[PDB]
A paper describes a structure:
Recently, comparative analysis of the rifamycin biosynthetic gene clusters of A. mediterranei S699 (an R-B producer) and U32 (an R-SV producer), together with corresponding genetic complementation testing, strongly suggested that the cytochrome P450 enzyme Rif16 is involved in the conversion of R-SV to R-B16. Indeed, we found that R-L was significantly converted into R-B by Rif16 in the presence of seFdx, seFdR, and NADPH (trace xiii, xiv); the structure of the product was confirmed by the identical retention time of the product and the R-B authentic standard, co-elution with R-B in a co-injection experiment (trace xv), and the consistently observed m/z value of 754.3069 ([M-H]¯, calc.754.3069). These results clearly establish that Rif16 is the long-sought R-B synthase of rifamycin biosynthesis. In both of the structures, there was only one typical cytochrome P450 fold existing in an asymmetric unit.
In the absence of substrate, Rif16 adopts an open conformation characterized by retraction of the F and G helices, loss of order in the B′ helix, and missing electron density for the B′C and FG loops. A water molecule that is 2.5 Å away from the heme-iron forms the sixth axial ligand of Fe3+. The BB’ loop-B’ helix-B’C loop region, which is known to be important for substrate specificity determination, is significantly longer than those of many P450 enzymes that recognize smaller substrates. The missing electron density of this region in both structures suggests the great structural flexibility.
Author numbering: 19 to 50, 54 to 81, 102 to 191, 205 to 418
Amino acid sequence: LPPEFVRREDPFHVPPALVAVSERGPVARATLDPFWLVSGYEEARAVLSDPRFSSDRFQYRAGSFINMDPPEHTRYRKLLTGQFTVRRIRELGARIDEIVAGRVDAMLAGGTTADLMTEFAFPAPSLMICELLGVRYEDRAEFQQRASALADALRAFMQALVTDKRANPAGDIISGLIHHAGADPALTDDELINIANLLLIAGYDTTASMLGLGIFVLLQRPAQLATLRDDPSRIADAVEELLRYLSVVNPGIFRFAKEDLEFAGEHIPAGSTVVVSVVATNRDARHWPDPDLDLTRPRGPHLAFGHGVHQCLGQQLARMEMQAGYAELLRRLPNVRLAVPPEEVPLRNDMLTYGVHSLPIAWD
Ligand code: HEM
């Protein structure tokens, strides 16, 4: 909540206030009312899989499972996980390849410069989500217009979509939830709408911010760019390392104590806010001796997608988009470079998810 804990003056450093708090320990009391800040890798994994911590902000919209606990969460989670099938994953991977290639085709057709956010980083994830939800070609413009806005207009869209899927089932996930998931009870229109919007909202800004902040960082770290571009077989490690290092979720992952409890030696009253700082945890020097950006590091676990029963439902889609997107940009925009000085690129401090507002780039 205090801005000291939110603001990141630069993608390369942990916010000084956080560094300060983490010196008092990996689960540390701070003041909002005391809340606790988790900055240790092993302790963050503990809290995120400890059942004494809730995702319900208040207890201590139907189908909005991100703020539910088991067993209500489990119902929805099982249904969505059920519908992330190998067929769906395979078809979405191909669609993602086509999406990223189309946006790069458009950028090359248009000139030798572009704002990467406008032309690539927002379009790619919104189109991905179109394909996931079953939005028809002729409705993407409208979906993109709305998506920018940032219910009830958007809520009206998903209602229409839902009604269309009940009448006319396709292979999308909303169709799957209606017709194929053996749901019982059957999902209401309201639940389907909130699920659809949850997927949009969880996957849009996050994926966009990884795509733009990642290119921003690589543009400033020529040895790292050259590694991604020149060794395409290590795209999977590169993406893990970008996920860990950029830590776009900000100011972190929130939980709320269900009851008075003791954790890592702290005495936390029921209701208290506990926040896992993704960027601090992902640079825990007790776990990564050298936590600097290194795209040659073999893949190991991080917290960028969280952990436990709520860990990112979309993480495989997100990975496929980042793997396909970063590789497509670096392969196809020759000598890609910033078109302004790096210090002039505006970062998103005054918003939740960290990233960039705009990213002017050029190529030959
Ligand atoms: C780089 C991109 C992304 C990042 C960093 C990200 C990160 C996260 C994190 C940290 C959580 C856990 C929140 C918590 O524990 O409270 C989360 C949950 C979630 N993510 Fe993502 N995510 C991304 C992309 C996506 C995509 C593309 C979708 C599309 C389906 C998506 C859907 C979700 C949903 C539905 C949840 C809630 C899961 C539940 O509560 O069971 N995410 N994500």
